[PDB]
A paper describes a structure:
It carries out this function by equilibrating between the high-O2-affinity relaxed state (R-state) and the low-O2-affinity tense state (T-state). On the other hand, stabilization of the R-state and/or destabilization of the T-state leads to a decrease in the P50 (increase Hb affinity for oxygen) or shifts the OEC to the left. A number of aromatic aldehydes that bind and increase Hb affinity for oxygen have been studied by our group for their potential therapeutic application in SCD treatment.
Subsequent crystallization of the deoxyHb-compound complex in test tubes using 3.2–3.6 M sulfate/phosphate precipitant pH 6.5, and ferrous citrate (50 μL) in a glovebox under nitrogen atmosphere led to formation of two different crystal forms. The nitro group oxygen also makes direct inter-subunit hydrogen-bond interaction with the amide of α1Thr137 (3.4 Å). The T ↔ R allosteric transition is known to lead to significant rearrangement of the α1-subunit position relative to the α2-subunit, resulting in a much larger central water cavity in the T-state Hb compared to the R2-state Hb. The final Rfactor/Rfree of the T-state and R2-state structures are 15.1/19.1 and 18.6/22.8%, respectively.
Numbering used by the authors:
A (entry chain A), C (entry chain C): 1 to 141
B (entry chain D), D (entry chain B): 1 to 146
Write the structure that this text describes.
C-alpha cells in the first residue's frame, strides 16, 4: 500500500517530470528493449529503432497514464480502469514484464532527476510503479 | 545447472509411462485455462471461451501433442538442451514472437499435470528432477532470443 | 480478486483435504526444499531431511494458516495480519519465495486430489495462493 | 550469452570513474532502504531506524565497501565469473544463508545508483551492458548453492 509519505514523494518527484513525460517514457521503453530484449516480443509491429515516432508516441501514452495515476493516487483502480481492461483482455502482456518496465522507469528518473532521487523517494517510486503494475494486471484472470 | 545421474534416471523412468499426446493436450489446455492471457498466441484455434471448451478443443490437443513431442525428443539430449532447441528458439523469437516467460509457465503446468496424473509416484525427488528439466528446456528455448 | 466460483472451488478442494492438511503442508515444504534449494537459506536451524519433525511441525502451522484463510476468504488480510507482520518484520523472507511454495502447494494438492484437481479448480487454487502470498507480503515496505 | 567487446569496453570505461567505497555504501544503504527485508542480515549493525540512519550508518557503509570491492575486482574476470565467485558462492550459501535474490536486488539498486551518479552518461546501451554484468555476478554468486 502507498503510505501518505509515499504519495507526497511520488507527486513531488513526478511533478518534476512535467513536460518531459513523453521523453522519459520513450527513454524508459528504449532502456527496456535494450536491457530486456524479450520485451520486444510484444512490439513486433513497431519500428523499435532509436527515435522512432512509434516509441515516442507510446512513451507519451505510458507517461500520461502515470500522470493520471499520480493525480489519482487515492483511487488508481478506477482511474486506470480502461487501461487494466485493455492489458487484461487484449494486449495480454505477461505480468513479469511490468517489473522490467518499472525498473527502467526508475533508472530513467534516476538519470534525469539527480536532486529528487533520494533513497526515500527511490523506495516510494518503486512502490508506486509496483502498485500501478498491480492495478494493470488485476483483471488478468 | 546440470542433472545428476539419479535425476536423469528418475526423469527417464517417469517418461516411459507418459502418453505424450494426452499429457501434451492436457498441459497446453491447462496453460490456457490457468493463465488465460496465454491465449493471445492461439487466436485462430477456435473456441477457448470456457475451461471445458479449451480442454476439448481439437486444435489445442493437436498443438499440445506437437509441443510435448518436441519436449519429449529433447529428453534424449539432456546434456545439450541449448543445441537441441536452438532452431525452435529462433523460431519462437523471430517468427512467433512468444515471450519466453510462457515456457516457464508451461513448465510449471506440466509439473502439475504429472503430479495430478501420477499421484504418489510423483515424489518430491522426482519433481525436483523435472523442475530442473523444465527450467533447462525453458532456458534453451529462450537462449536465441535477441 | 477471487470470484465466487474461485471461493467455491477453494472451499471444495480444501474441504476434501480435510484432516490431511498438515501432512500436505509438510510435503509441500519438502517439495520446495528439493526443487528450489535457495529456499533452504531461511531454515539453517532446521534438519531438512525427509521426515523431519521440524518440517512436519512447520507444515502443520502453514496448513492451519491456509485453513484459516479459507475460513475467512472474504476477510483474509485481517485473518493473516499477524503472519503478515511476522514475515515482513522478523522472518523477512524475500517475496519471490512465496511463488515457489505456492507452486509446491499446488503440486502437492494435485498429487492428492485426482478427482477434484480439475483445470478450473487448479486455476482457482493458483489465484488463491497468489492472493495469500500477496497478503503475506503486503507489509514488507 | 555474454558481453560484446564494445560492451566490455563500456563497462570498464565507466567503472574507471567509480569511487567504489562511496558507490558501495550508497548501493548497500539503498538496498536496505528500498528493500528493507534485506536488513535481516544486519541486526548487529546498529541504527537502521530511518533512511538517513541506514545511509549514515558506518557499519552499513563498511559492508558496502567490502561487497562492492569484491564486485569491482570481479570485473577483471568477466569471462570467468562463476570461477571467480565460486568460493564466495559456497560461503554465502553454507555459512551466511543469503538468499540469492538479494544479489539480484543489489544489482538492480546498483544500476539505479550508477544512473543517479552518472546521469546522461549512463545511456541505454551502457545500462544494457551493466544489466548483463549484474545478472552474471548474481548468477555466479548463486551457482554453488545446494
Ligand atoms: C507502468 C506500466 C504500463 C503502463 C502505465 C502502460 C500504459 C499503456 C497505455 C496508456 C497504452 C496505450 C492505450 C491506448 O492507446 O488506448 C498501452 C499500450 C500497450 N502496452 Fe502497456 N503499459 C504498461 C506496461 C506495459 C508493458 C510492461 C508492456 C510489454 C512489455 C506493455 C505493452 C503494451 C503494448 C504492446 C501496447 C500497445 C501499443 C500500440 O500498439 O500502440 N505495456 N500501455
Ligand atoms: C516446452 C516448450 C515448447 C516447445 C518444445 C514448443 C515447440 C513447438 C513446436 C515443435 C512448434 C511447431 C512449429 C513448426 O513445426 O514449425 C511450435 C509452434 C508454436 N508454439 Fe511452441 N513450444 C513450446 C512452448 C510454447 C508456449 C508456452 C507457447 C505459448 C503460450 C508456444 C507458442 C507456439 C505457437 C503460437 C506456435 C505456432 C502455432 C501455430 O501454427 O499456429 N509454444 N512450438
Ligand atoms: C502460503 C505461504 C506461507 C504461509 C501460510 C506461511 C505461514 C507460516 C506460519 C503459520 C508460520 C509459523 C508462525 C509461528 O510459529 O508463529 C511461519 C513461519 C515461518 N515461515 Fe512462513 N508461510 C508461508 C510462506 C513462507 C515461505 C515461502 C518461506 C521461505 C521460503 C517461509 C519461511 C518461514 C520461516 C523460516 C518460518 C519460521 C519457522 C520456524 O523457525 O519455526 N514461509 N510461516
Ligand atoms: C555483488 C554482490 C556481493 C558480493 C560480491 C559480496 C561479497 C562479500 C564478501 C567479499 C564478503 C566477506 C567474506 C569474508 O569475510 O570471507 C561478504 C560477506 C557478507 N555478505 Fe556478501 N556480497 C554480495 C552481496 C551480498 C548481499 C546482497 C547480502 C545481503 C543482503 C550479503 C550478505 C553478506 C553478509 C551478511 C556477510 C557477512 C559480513 C560480516 O560478517 O561482517 N552479501 N560478501
Ligand atoms: C503497497 C504494497 C504492496 C506490497 C508492498 C511491499 O512491497 N513488497 O514487494 O511486498 O507494498
Ligand atoms: C485477485 C487477483 C489479483 C491479480 C489477479 C490476476 O492474476 N494475475 O496473475 O495478475 O487476480
Amino acid at each position: 500500500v502507498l503510505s501518505p509519505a509515499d504519495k507526497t514523494n511520488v507527486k513531488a518527484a513526478w511533478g518534476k517530470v512535467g513536460a518531459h513525460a513523453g521523453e522519459y517514457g520513450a527513454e524508459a521503453l528504449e532502456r527496456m528493449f535494450l536491457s530486456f530484449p524479450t520485451t520486444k516480443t510484444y512490439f513486433p509491429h513497431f519500428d523499435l529503432s532509436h527515435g522512432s515516432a512509434q516509441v515516442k508516441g507510446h512513451g507519451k501514452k505510458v507517461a500520461d497514464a502515470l500522470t493520471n495515476a499520480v493525480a489519482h493516487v487515492d483511487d488508481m483502480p478506477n482511474a486506470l480502469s480502461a487501461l487494466s481492461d485493455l492489458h487484461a483482455h487484449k494486449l495480454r502482456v505477461d505480468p513479469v514484464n511490468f517489473k522490467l518496465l518499472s525498473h527502467c522507469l526508475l533508472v530513467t528518473l534516476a538519470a534525469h532527476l539527480p536532486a529528487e532521487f533520494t533513497p526515500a523517494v527511490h523506495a516510494s517510486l518503486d512502490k508506486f510503479l509496483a502498485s500501478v503494475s498491480t492495478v494493470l494486471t488485476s483483471k488478468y484472470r | 545447472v546440470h542433472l545428476t545421474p539419479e535425476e536423469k534416471s528418475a526423469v527417464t523412468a517417469l517418461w516411459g509411462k507418459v502418453n505424450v499426446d494426452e499429457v501434451g493436450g492436457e498441459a497446453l489446455g491447462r496453460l490456457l485455462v490457468v493463465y488465460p492471457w496465454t491465449q493471445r498466441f492461439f487466436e485462430s484455434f477456435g473456441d477457448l471461451s470456457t475451461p471445458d471448451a479449451v480442454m476439448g478443443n481439437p486444435k489445442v490437443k493437436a498443438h499440445g501433442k506437437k509441443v510435448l513431442g518436441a519436449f519429449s525428443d529433447g529428453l534424449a539430449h539432456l546434456d545439450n538442451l541449448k543445441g537441441t532447441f536452438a532452431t525452435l528458439s529462433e523460431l519462437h523469437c523471430d517468427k512467433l514472437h512468444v515471450d519466453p516467460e510462457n515456457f516457464r509457465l508451461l513448465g510449471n503446468v506440466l509439473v502439475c499435470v504429472l503430479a495430478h496424473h501420477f499421484g504418489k509416484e510423483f515424489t518430491p525427488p522426482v519433481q525436483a528432477a523435472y523442475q530442473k528439466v523444465v527450467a533447462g528446456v525453458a532456458n534453451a528455448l529462450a537462449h536465441k532470443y535477441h
